Design a protein around this ligand. Structure first.
Ligand SMILES: O=C(O)c1ccc(NS(=O)(=O)c2ccc(N3C(=O)c4ccccc4C3=O)cc2)cc1
Ligand SMILES: CCCCCCCCCCCCC/C=C/[C@H](O)[C@H](N)CO
Lengths: 278, 170, 116
């Protein structure tokens, strides 16, 4: 967020110093300023880079998931009375691309849950205000098997009970990585296959570290069902905070295809433009 | 295991040759696969050893469902990972411009999210060499010049001694 | 290197201390002591064969107990010349002793003989 250097007055030049000429082969960028190649006036620079700090770049809540749940009679096998969403930023694209400008990152994370609901039909009465349970299931904790099984006691899991109509729920977590930074890219495997092991052993997905690195969110409607079916969507908004990032990378240029770096479609991003056309 | 590296790319030609190589050291150089299945490249193909691999000019989808290749399909202009090759210069890099230099030297520190990691599971660095300007020489016959990589581990540090790991091959 | 100025190339000059199979390809040779020689304005390259011996002296005869090792040369990249340039050239080799070198036990040589 630092200010910018002033432009210094620069007059005619006639000398053996040639800042214009360089050698990009060295791998360095020629740090020229306008006064190196043209005559410049004195300008007291007042612009700053306050809004391009990494913190400012990521200081936005981005939607990373839309978790759909129902409030309906359990006999209705079509309805889904609870939903489990594995935590990740890779279900949407925008925040993913912003994060993947970099190879490593540390940040606290602010989760904000925006809950919307609606009737599905109009001939089965009405509903009282719903309460939603959002339980964090860290890896290894038992995953709910039913909307009302014992796991929802949440004696040790953190849970947020959100009352419909209240302002979106919000919680914060610190940096919870087991490494010293989050790895946006992992060039490796969880397993190394060993010679003599059958083809079904030692095989792991390329670039995946843990089968379950950050656990899940289990969402249900706590209320018992009304005579009419209600559908709800919980939109999850992530905001990195206190961000640090390492090893910048070129941003994604073609559409994402899965959680890896794979690509299948849209491999022609650049449009056509004449070489000598302005 | 932990180690930095000194990578030395060697490519000499004559004053009448032309061409340019971009040599990039990419931390966590993940490459795109060749199938509809995500993250499906097998360990053996992801770790080819000294022979390395080659970038391709276009994406070919592996449709052999019975015996999938499970290999990388790294497209050159996508830098093998869905990012425009022109931007790869954000990575530590040098250019071997045959009119100017015949070698590039990259000194890479250990880069990882951990102080030390498993060297068999995880490749900390990738080296990419892309012809930025094609090789050319004033002859009808196709000229060819060799590129030689000479790499020195640096500040090697190892922990957790036991019997030797023998990775599966082929 | 006694080629033309327009010739370029990189060579590898290797010394393998004894006790293993003699290097017959660059792959084995580069595991020993070696220098990668870039043919350029400075047309000469020196490789020091360091004193690496079990015994404090070696004998001046062929003897496996005090064998010295193997010296080899390989193409690192290759020799490249433009058109209108000789495609075959010569290199010359020289050897000398370093300042740490010494000899002992004077003796008659086999390099000169006389007949009645
Ligand atoms: O309205 C918007 O804000 C919103 C609207 C569209 C949008 N992009 S999308 O490509 O249409 C899209 C649409 C849905 C999902 N999505 C699911 O279908 C889902 C199921 C379960 C868990 C998580 C998710 C999740 O992300 C992801 C992306 C994102 C957010
Ligand atoms: C209601 C409480 C829920 C609390 C959830 C805490 C989980 C925090 C997850 C943060 C997400 C970090 C981003 C992911 C990092 C990289 O992808 C991984 N290192 C590789 O999978």
């Amino acid at each position: 967020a630092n200010n910018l250097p002033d432009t210094q007055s620069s007059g005619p030049a006639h000398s053996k110093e040639t800042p214009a000429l360089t050698a990009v082969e060295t791998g360095a960028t020629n740090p020229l300023v306008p006064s190196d190649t043209v005559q410049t006036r004195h300008v007291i620079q007042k612009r700053t880079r306050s809004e391009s700090t990494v913190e400012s770049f990521f200081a936005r809540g981005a939607c990373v998931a839309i978790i759909e749940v129902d409030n309906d009679a359990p006999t209705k096998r079509a309805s889904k009375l609870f939903s489990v969403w594995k935590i990740t930023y890779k279900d949407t694209v925008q925040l993913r691309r912003k994060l993947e400008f970099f190879t490593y990152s540390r940040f606290d994370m602010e989760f904000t849950f925006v809950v919307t609901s609606n009737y599905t039909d109009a001939n089965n009465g009405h509903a009282l205000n719903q309460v939603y349970q959002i339980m964090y299931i860290p890896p290894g904790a038992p995953i709910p098997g039913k909307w009302n099984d014992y796991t929802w006691q949440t004696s040790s899991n953190p849970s947020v009970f959100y009352t419909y109509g209240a302002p979106p729920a919000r919680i914060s977590v610190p940096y919870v990585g087991i490494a010293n930074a989050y790895s946006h890219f992992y060039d490796g495997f969880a397993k190394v296959p060993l010679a003599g092991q059958a083809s079904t052993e030692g095989d792991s997905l390329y670039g995946a570290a843990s089968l379950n690195d950050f656990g899940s969110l289990a969402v249900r409607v706590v209320n018992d069902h009304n005579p009419t079916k209600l559908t709800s969507k919980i939109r999850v908004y992530m905001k990195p905070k206190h961000v640090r990032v390492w090893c910048p990378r070129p941003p994604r240029a073609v559409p994402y295809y899965g959680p890896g770096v794979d690509y299948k479609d849209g491999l022609a991003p650049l449009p056509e433009k004449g070489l000598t056309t302005y | 295991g932990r180690a930095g590296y000194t990578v030395h790319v060697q490519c000499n030609a004559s004053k009448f040759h032309q061409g340019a190589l971009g040599v990039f050291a990419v931390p966590e150089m993940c490459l795109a696969g060749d199938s509809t299945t995500h993250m499906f490249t097998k360990y053996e193909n992801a770790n080819p050893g000294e022979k390395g691999g080659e970038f391709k000019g276009s994406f070919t989808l592996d449709t052999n469902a019975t015996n999938p290749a499970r290999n990388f399909c790294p497209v050159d202009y996508l830098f093998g990972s869905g990012v425009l090759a022109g931007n790869a210069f954000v990575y530590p890099h040098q250019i071997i411009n045959l009119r100017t230099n015949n070698c590039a030297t990259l000194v890479l520190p250990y880069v990882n999210s951990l102080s030390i990691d498993s060297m068999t599971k995880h490749n900390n660095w990738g080296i990419a060499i892309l012809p930025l300007a094609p090789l050319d020489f004033a002859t009808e016959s196709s000229t060819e010049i060799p590129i030689t990589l000479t790499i020195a581990p640096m500040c090697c540090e190892f922990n957790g001694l036991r019997n030797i790991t023998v990775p599966r091959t082929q | 290197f006694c080629g033309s100025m327009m010739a370029t190339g990189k060579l590898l000059v290797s010394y393998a201390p004894p006790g293993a199979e003699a290097p017959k390809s660059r792959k084995e040779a580069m595991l020993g002591t070696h220098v990668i020689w870039d043919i350029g304005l400075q047309s000469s390259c020196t490789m020091v064969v360091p004193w690496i011996s079990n015994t404090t002296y070696r004998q001046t005869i062929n003897d496996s107990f005090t064998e010295g090792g193997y010296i080899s040369m390989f193409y690192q990249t290759r020799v490249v010349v433009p058109l209108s340039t000789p495609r075959k050239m010569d290199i010359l080799g020289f050897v000398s002793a370093c300042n740490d070198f010494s000899v002992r036990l004077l003796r008659d040589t086999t390099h000169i003989s006389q007949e009645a």
